[model samples]
Target: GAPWWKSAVFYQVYPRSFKDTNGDGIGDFKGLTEKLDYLKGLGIDAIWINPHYASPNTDNGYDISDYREVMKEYGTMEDFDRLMAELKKRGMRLMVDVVINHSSDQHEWFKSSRASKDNPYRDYYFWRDGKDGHEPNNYPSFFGGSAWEKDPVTGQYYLHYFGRQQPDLNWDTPKLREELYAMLRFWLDKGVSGMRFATVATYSKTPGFPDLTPEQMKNFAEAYTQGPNLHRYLQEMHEKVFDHYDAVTAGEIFGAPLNQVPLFIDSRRKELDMAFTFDLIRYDRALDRWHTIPRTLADFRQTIDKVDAIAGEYGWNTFFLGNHDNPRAVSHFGDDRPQWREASAKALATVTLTQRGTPFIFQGDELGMTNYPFKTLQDFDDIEVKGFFQDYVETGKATAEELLTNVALTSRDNARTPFQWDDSANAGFTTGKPWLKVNPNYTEINAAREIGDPKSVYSFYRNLISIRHETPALSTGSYRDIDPSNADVYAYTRSQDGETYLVVVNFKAEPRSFTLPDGMHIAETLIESSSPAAPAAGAASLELQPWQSGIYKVK
Candidate 1:
């Protein structure tokens, strides 16, 4: 009864930056198809591609104008079919991104819905009259500004949770729900192995559409997240489309309460296969984007422990340190400085992969990519970054220097920069100018260098994936946090049957002494990031070097 995804090592590819074969500056499906050998050689079992559907690129490809057709910039539908065939030939699965929570305003449904309120498609989206010339509610768009935008033709405001160009579909309408289900089945029929449901928890809205107070508006995700009918709608989707395929599904339920995660992912509930929560990633984020705090080891432990506690027998988990929407994992959570970048990157990988979940590796993370070096606002390209800068920095609430610091640390552009494939022009990602600037550090961090070096980050990731595949405890074992109070060291044990693996990580920049659990003995040194001499199996104490991580077979 084991599912293929349970033990699969997923590599997420942001197509725009992965490769460009046509010298057109933008990454195309053929480019990705050509890189299949590179991904397969890296030991990836599956790939979760970011949205490559036809779109206007407002929020990158998240805003889809046509769900069925391939984006012209990426390639044609025939190219996508070839990509799928190539992946299958290589024994790799594909997980397509499903951004059904909203669609591009250019979509046929939205176009008709806004043509006139009397149009049959009018009920497809949420539209209401303004309240005394004000928006329907105080809900703020995730990017910036009011969540509602007035349609001059219809003279009514429509809800857009993210951007005005992306209109939220009214899931309350049965026809709309059926339309989405049919779309999902269409893809499954075409051989997609899974779907990454983007911002899926926001599908259903609260009844009555109440306004929020200014204070409540700061953390307004609570206002429209996990509405009453969310579970019902998901179950219906399962019954209609998912139940038939030998597929896996994961939902991005960023703002939903952590305790409710099991209901969405537990197999007994027959809902999603897994849920991706932001409890750990958001630890450093405040209500205001400008006012950010740095995350500490305690913060990481707390979030992981909470997730571990909630995952029961029927519940499963998906682990990832970085993705398309977030900054680079090594830069955000680990030390990205020259001296410790590789060590910390491997350590962070050990921390996530040795836990009880299916680990996901972001596009360039295997090569230890760092954040973009942003000196000014113009260096950034994300809508969220540009919109927030205009609203807060331009208005004088914050300074350019202050916001620049934040963007350098957490901007989505950090992960969006072109993949550092080699030291060639545009870092070998494209023969022409890249759509986004290639990280200047490509000279040192390119895959060409790492792929050949036995001690490189790419090699470490390849080994880590092999260990997870060989170790049953890593994928489906019980998790137990060791010394949760330790600030410098994050240690945990994964046990199944009579076998156990102990993972120890030092998050600091200095050596830290860690004592083995009472009477426990290390049977073997499974993996270690540092080349320093390892301690004996029965040694009572061990000195973990700066940013060091080690996985030990223990008894």
Candidate 2:
């Protein structure tokens, strides 16, 4: 009864930045197909790619113009077919993003929905009459401005939790569900063995479009995610689609309380196999994402430990520190400075891969990718930053200089940069200019360079993936924080059926001393952050490198 994904190492690909076979400077399905061997070499069991659905470039394909077609930038359906066939040939499964929380305003349904109030498709979206000559509610969109956009022709407002170009679909309509479900099956029939439901928590809306309470304003979209019909809709969706397939499913769960996540992922509920949570990523980010907060190692461990206790024990969860929508792992959680970049990156991976859940390796992180340096606002590309930058500057909330600094540190574009394939021009991602600037450090940090270096971060990641595949404890074990009080080291043990593995990671930038738990002795070193300076392994009282991670079996 176990899901195949429980033991699979998933590599999340940001298609636009992955590879370009047509010299268009944008990655395509064929480009992805070109890298299947490299991925297989990394020991990943599956690939989770972002949407390449036809779009108007608003929100970078998150606004789906057509659910059943491939984005022209990513090549044709034939190209996609080749990519899918190749993954199957190489023994890997595919999971595609399904962004049905909203659709492009240019979508046929939206165009028809706004054609007239009497249109049969009018109920397919959240169309409402404006109140008192203004917007329907006081909800500010997750992007910016009013969540409601007034349709001039119809003189009614439509809700968009994200960009104005993406109108929220009204799951209240039976026809909308049928249409979306059919769209899902189209891909499933195309050999998509998994589904990554985007904005899964916000599928339903609150009744009456009520104004948010001052407290609720902290997270405006919270109102959108707690609709009374949320669970009911997902329950029905499962019976109609996911339950009929052997495919896996993971929802992009946001705003939903952690306690209730199991209701969606537990096999008993029959809703989803797993779900992604943003709690760890949001730890250092404030409401605006520009202002930063301070955190300690204990705080980090507490968050991961708690999420694992609930999300793991009840059902399952995800273990990933970076993704397409956030800064690179090495840049955000680990030190990206020249001194510790590689070691810290490997350290982060060692922890993530050893955790008791599915591990998702975001594109480029395996090579210790750092954030792209931003000298000016002109260097920015993500819609979220561009919109928030203007709001921060215009409202006099923060200076342009301040926003630029924080944005450079934490902006989504930092993660969206082109993947560095080699030391060549455009980092071997394309022969033409990239859609986003490739990080300049690509010459020193790239896939081709590290894939052959035994001590490189890329090699470390590959080793860890193989270890996870071999260690049953990592895939199905229970997690326990061994030294929860340690402020510098993340020490935990994963145990299954009497087999135990201890994972110790030094997050600090200075060497830290660590000892095994009482009555335990290192039996074998499974994997450790590699370095020429790392001395021959012996046993107790280890002085770990600045950013060292060590996993060992103890007796």
- Model 1 global lDDT (CA atoms, 0 to 1): 0.88
TM-score for candidate 1, please give it: 0.98
Candidate 1: the clashing residue pairs are none
Most accurate candidate by TM-score: 1
lDDT of each: 0.88, 0.86
Q: lDDT tens digits, residues 13-61, model 1?
A: 9998899998888888999999999999988999999999999999889
Query: Which consecutive 10 residues in model 2 have the weakest lDDT in total?
Result: 530-539
- Encode model 2's per-residue lDDT on 98-135: one tens digit a residue: 89899999999999999998999999998888888789
Which runs of model 1 end up more than 4 angstroms from their true locations? none
Error of 2 at 523 (Å): 1.3
RMSD of each predicted structure: 1.2, 1.6
